[PDB]
Amino acid sequence: QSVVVDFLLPTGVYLNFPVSRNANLSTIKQLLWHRAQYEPLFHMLSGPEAYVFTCINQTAEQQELEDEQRRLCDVQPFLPVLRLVAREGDRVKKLINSQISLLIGKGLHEFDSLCDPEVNDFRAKMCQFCEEAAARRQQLGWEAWLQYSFPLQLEPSNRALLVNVKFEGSEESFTFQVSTKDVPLALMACALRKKATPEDYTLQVNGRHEYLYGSYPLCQFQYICSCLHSGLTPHLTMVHSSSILAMRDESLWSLEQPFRIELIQGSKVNADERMKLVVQAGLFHGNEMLCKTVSSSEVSVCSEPVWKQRLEFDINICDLPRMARLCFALYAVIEKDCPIAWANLMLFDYKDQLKTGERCLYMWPSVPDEKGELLNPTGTVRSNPNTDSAAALLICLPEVAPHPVYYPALEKILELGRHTEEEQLQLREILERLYEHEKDLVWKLRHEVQEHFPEALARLLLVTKWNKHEDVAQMLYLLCSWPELPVLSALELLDFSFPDCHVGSFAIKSLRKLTDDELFQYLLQLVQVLKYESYLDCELTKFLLDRALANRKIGHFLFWHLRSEMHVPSVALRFGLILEAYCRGSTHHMKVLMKQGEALSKLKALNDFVKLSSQKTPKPQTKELMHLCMRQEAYLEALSHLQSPLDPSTLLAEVCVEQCTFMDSKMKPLWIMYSNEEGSVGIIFKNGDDLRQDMLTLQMIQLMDVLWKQEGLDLRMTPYGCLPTGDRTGLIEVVLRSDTIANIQLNKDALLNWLKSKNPGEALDRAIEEFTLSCAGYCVATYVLGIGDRHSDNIMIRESGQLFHIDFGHFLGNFNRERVPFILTYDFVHVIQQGKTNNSEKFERFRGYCERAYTILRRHGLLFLHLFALMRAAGLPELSCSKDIQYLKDSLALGKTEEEALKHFRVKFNEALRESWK
Template sequence: MPPGVYCPVDFWAKEENQTILVDFLLPTGIYLNFPVSRNASLGNIKKLLWQRAQQEPLFHILGAPSSYVFTCINQTAEQQELEDEQRRLCDIQPFLPVLRLVAREGDRAEKLLNSQISLLINRGLHDFDSLNDAEVNDFRTKMRQFCEHVASCRQQLTWESWMESNFPLQLEPSTTLFTKPLFSKSIMINVKFENSEETFTLQVSPRDLPISVIQLALRKKSNVSGQRCPVGPGEYTLQINGMLEYIYGNYPLCQFKVSGRHKPPPLPTKKPHLCSLWSLEKPFCFHLSFGYNVNADEGLKLLVYCGLYHGNELLCKTVASAEVNASSEPQWQQKLEFEINVCDLPRMTRLSLALYAVDKSKKGKSTKKKSKKDYPIAWVNTMLFDYKDMLKCGQYSLCMWSSFPDEKAELLNPMGTVQCNPNTESAATLVINFMNMSDYPVYYPSLDKILELGRLGEVSNPTQDERQQLQEIVERKGQAELYEHEKELVWKLRHEIRERHPEALPKLLLTTKWNKHEDVAQMVYLLQTWPELPVLTALELLDFNYPDRYVGSFTMTCLRKLTNEELCQYLLQLVQVLKYESYLDCELTTFLLERALIHRKIGHFLFWHLRSEMHVPAVALRFGLILEAYCRGSNYHMKVLIKQGEALSKLKGLNDFVRSSVQKTNKAQAKEAMHMCMRQETYLEPLSHLYSPLDPNLILTDVCVELCTFMESKMKPLWIVYNNELFGGNRVGIIFKNGDDLRQDMLTLQMIRLMDVLWKKEGLDLRVTPYGCLSTGDKTGLIEVVMRSDTIANIQRNKSNMAATAAFNKDALLNWLKSKNPGEALEQAIEEFTLSCAGYCVATYVLGIGDRHSDNIMIRESGQLFHIDFGHFLGNFKTKFGFNRERVPFILTYDFVHVIQQGKTSNSEKFERFREYCEKAYMILRCHGALFLNLFALMKAAGLPELTCSKDIQYLKDSLALGKSDEEALKHFRVKFNEALRESWKTKVNWFAHTVSKDNRQ
């Protein structure tokens, strides 16, 4: 190993066979100290400890080794039970080399599973237990039962169906797993009562389950025993082992268990008195009590702004509290009343609060609006109804969040989470009291009551003029705001919209007066008979603007038609939409879990999309609970994911080691040290023979250590190469990044992949390369290496005599393609280049991709051009000294044109064909403009720095010319195309500056 370089980074990552002196504490109070191999498993260490303990006092009072488990203090200073005895000591890495042996309590298998899940999702399940939260507990119980049920169904799949769900073909069939007619056959059910030997068989239709089974079983028991069954059907529970969709036809006999306990008839009791929300025609109010942990300068005043929201719609005027002197524990003791009656509060109302400091020395007269003299301190949101539909009452302590959204013009942050800040010790906190609005608990009316009121709505007969106005509103492209008279017309003609324009449902929902319960009831009533929308249209209804649960239920009905491939395509957005959900238990969560547990690829990416944000406090609880449920329903896949997690952990440690090495020595020596480290068994074993996180259908077999390296950029990304016999003998490469947020790259590549799908549907294959990219944690992730390719910068540099003039060498690209594609193959390579160049010209223009230089545009040896590194999009171009460095709509340089024209300046026919490709590709995307707007809108919850609000999506509307006719839009694109070609010399100058700057850095 080169001098000055040390292999990783703490005493757990030393030489493979090195022993470590470990202290052992036995349950008998005996202390032992002896060396063990750092590579030894806990099981082997326990055997060795048992041999040593036999020579010690009090050994005879110890039980069997299996009755005990090791505990340690882990790296986060918490005590951890080490149930998985196959794990090695070097992988556990306790804070100190001290292992304590304690008696095992409870179900060993359950504790082992809990330990593995905690390790995998990076959060201890005991955290969920310690919350003592009724909603959390109910959700965990429900999801556990649901996932275990789906898992039991999966076990009854035929071999072919199991293979399809775990290892689907790349071209999947259009049919789903649920293709058999549901009610085609009756099934035979074997029924057995608890504490009884008698069994009997029932024949029922699947449509009758489960209630009729209980009734038939009890009737049968009464007939068999000759006695009337003392317990009614409602007091029995039915456990269904097996999924009906898979049972009938293939599995005619299924075990059912009807259990109940005999008890005397209950005494008549009074039903609890409840109060309907709609009966309370008085203003809503709450009591603002006090705050604590507030950090504000002396001399300032503190006040709280309050607003009631339904989605982004403000239900009534905001209310401001009185101003009080700044202190760590400000006191208000004030009743705050809103201009809305309790009866008109919609079910999904959320109360948004924001704490502000006011500089009284500069404060103007108005306190109703924020001015530059108001300084935001913290915000918090909470729902007015609990998860059981009851209006909240009593005292609540709301721990606030200190980071405000970028839309500075807004007082409040209704789109933020309704979860309180888990940092209860230091977060600013408001204590409020929801006052009793009635002598009895207040509930939100049931669906039956809502529909009963909704039936009373009037149906208007539109005039011809009104129909024409409605047609114009419906056909309006984009998400333009409607005028008040247009909103009134849309609401008036809501039945006409249902019959003739059902796709305009989002516009109708935005015109609904959600602060009038009569209008809400009419909208819900209308929704019951609304025609199902196409999947891509229904995606818009997932937006934060549509929080109503009946709208959500309708949306999920539409989305259930998503094929597995389509669901994978939009999974990134669906996971982000979970952040908009107000309660843990929602139909979207159940839908995603159900599909994930049946289809392995969906489960894989659902897991990593959730796992990658477990470090975010606002979503850690929700995402952690969903991950727990998925793991419980997919034990086999969990083992695969654990292996992937171990590999990523090793890559992170290796990356830290490489960064440290580079600071102490040169690149060659650091690379040699990296190889020595990778050859250790503790690295080689976790990194080999695992399913690729980038593609769950691909197994990464043997690491080709000699070809592994690290890249020159600041964070020293790792370049890992695999010899892969299962992949046609070709090598596979992945890049591990630590320190860069890959979520924006993921979104951009998803959009390019979607564009490719849309183009191919129209018969246009533009040979784009949407390579794999996956965020796996806090600024960590993986990128697929596109093998047999190089950057334009390297090609120009290698084909030029002087590095400084490389950017101006127009023959470099063509000569490189000739060298890789001799003879007749060259024409096909140029065609590949032409098609792919057209695809990326259009894609980068529409998405507003910035920071385009010769190091992030690459070419494959087959001729396909593609872009990488998407750190800037939606028109966020780089500037230097106040000037825009990128002054062209997209990259179309003369050396690109030189290749397209096959090196002949007179070959204008080839260039015109390229122009036609671009125009056709652009017009196809424009037809699907609403889909791109919706998908970007759903990503606002992701917190990407360049996509935080609706204004950021304006670039897409402009680039796709959504406010113009097709002829005007095509003319608009032609102007941009000519501008890109005319101004391409500026791109060359920019590339020259980039090359010189890079050479100077090196």
């Protein structure tokens, strides 16, 4: 517990001596001055508080270490080298800039090192934009800041129960009856009169940052709704507006020449010498070829192959669209196949100028897949960051004019864009219910599509010929005066098929209608779509940043979605720059995320210790050896006292170390338990597997729950939290007071008698209804989503009666991919019928619930399709192709009618009931 540290004094003098790792910097500075007095040039030094330490952190950046309560082990300098420097200048920007680098897992100097104007202009614009919003937030009032920081958590939308009100500082409390449908201004008034015997206060839940306020009634709050249904009394606190302020403070068409490019040289190729190298090439707009795929002459396989060839394409320079991308692929054929690598390049830059001169494209390796295409146009345009090791292709776009030439402005496109009953009957049949003949028909009637069929804009964009500039200008003319579509349609337009910048801008324009509640449901999908964006500065990035600055919760989850993919080279740059901008516009929340980061940093190290110890020693000894590592001052303080990543309104206060443990699984998941002034809260830190799959499924189950709750149907689901935090790392919410089916059973009345012990007497009939409602919901959810590999180990039941599923590994038919049938277990049907062999009344309600649930999802079926389609970006094995989306089309049965689909569901229901006995 000690290390030799190099010290560098501002007079040029060098001290070197051991210090403890747990010792903080302020303490280290005192030891330094105590040894500096016995070294030359001491008299010329100022006092210790005049100086500040500087180190080289893990991201290779100088960091002015202003907070001297940090421990040297927590600072993590690259080498143990501290240097004293003057504590003056603009220390605010200096402190933030370093704290960003550590927090995002990427140094800001790496953005500078690229010498890229696009990057620098993104940083300039977005940081300025974000800083202004943060400034503007501070000038605004306390109520508005409360909306930003602690937004309203409401249910998707007559009794008289008690409520235990308190005030800040006072130990005494007040219990009294208040109605469910009251507006919280009235609830404060009642408590305020009790204090003696309104608008300057707001309510707060105990042990939480969840505040009750605004125009809504008390029943629509999640805390109240939970307290009413369960039985317990709400425990509140009356916070003053002063205490809230304390938180606030403390020309192109001229050039008709055919398009071409010079294929010069390849670099750092690694293939078999017997073969010969070929460079496949082709132009693209979205997932559609603009012209034929040109190929190069064969050259022998070496590290540095040379071609020097002209590669002429069958399209003019004037005919190119705005988002045109030259997609390459390096192969290895036999002289008389093997994809090595691929790389894409945008012909026009971010400022709309057509690119010229040499471009060194550092290529990405090709993975073999079920499609097996020539090129990969759906891949990222951004070059491979591993520049020195990975392969590359030297190319050169030729000069075509004396001065450079831009893609025409909106004004010039609009100028060029201007200017029967039988064919109208054909248009109905195509759109309401595409082939080459149908494409030309719709394009002919494109004006009638705009007038009479606004929802089918997506169809019209695909049929448009993007390889002709005349067709492009006419489509954009219509687009710029196209009527505003709903959310559901706008989500479709964000997909990789619609790359055009005006199309994106239209899609975002329609998404500005979203409430923060509804935006949260699609936030994961919207993050993943950024992979399809070509340039860094885009409307979706701005939109996402706008909402994050507007709402702290959205910002919080925007951070962790982006942060958790910083290990991925293809998005590290794009995501890193967004996280920088976010951070600058939310300095208050940076402090929270820093605690969370360092808590997660220790759990990695704690899990790695447990992983190594599990191989050598047995479980009881390892469990005790875990607690010793936890109980250390650096580990205990970092894990204790922070807001939860899974829900930042929840407060993880005191680590209950004795209650912590770990399962003997493949990846050894840590089980961390907490306690706060409310009651108990727990988390599971999983490191080893990827949790995005499990998150997506849990999100979609949570979406079903909301969609059911909107239609007056509460199926008592448990959409618990799941958050990827990093490289195969994440937290998961502990569903308390519950157990697996395997542990309960290890016969006929196994689960039934478990409920009898947990719900004796009158509570038994309630818990069965909780089971029946929940089982129905999870039966329908698992059916629709196509979730296989279900069993006793990964199904759970709460003590209240609610059944729920966990740890979703596979979905949409996969396990080869076949149709997963509707599953009713004999044990579950036994509990639903109340221990009876036959109970038609209760089973008919259960049948009714599953049918009602299933019907509701068909009404919002396109949402599920559109959301799943956007998730193809994420590169999950089980959600890659269009046949994975097809699984949802069939399971929900959207092609069939509402009557037909429901009749087929009943057959699958009845066959599941028969299969239960077998």
